[PDB]
Amino acid sequence: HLEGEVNKIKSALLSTNKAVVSLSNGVSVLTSKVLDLKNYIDKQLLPIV
């Protein structure tokens, strides 16, 4: 039975790891968009202001 339990935990941690990858990918996209906003302000807004 116990190896069954150990196996459930391995599977669970594999799923947790996929969660962290997914979140990391979302933060990477968000980071790109924050940099885009900063560049838009400096290179589109400020020159016409």
Binding site: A12, K18, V20, L23, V27, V29, K33
Partner: protein
Amino acid sequence: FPSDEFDASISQVNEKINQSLAFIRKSDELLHNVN
């Protein structure tokens, strides 16, 4: 929303957050089955 590619990228971030939460749900469900 979404009005453009910036908004579409924001939507993608939200989809990745929801994927994260889904994978945690699955992990939690596997653990609540452990004794």
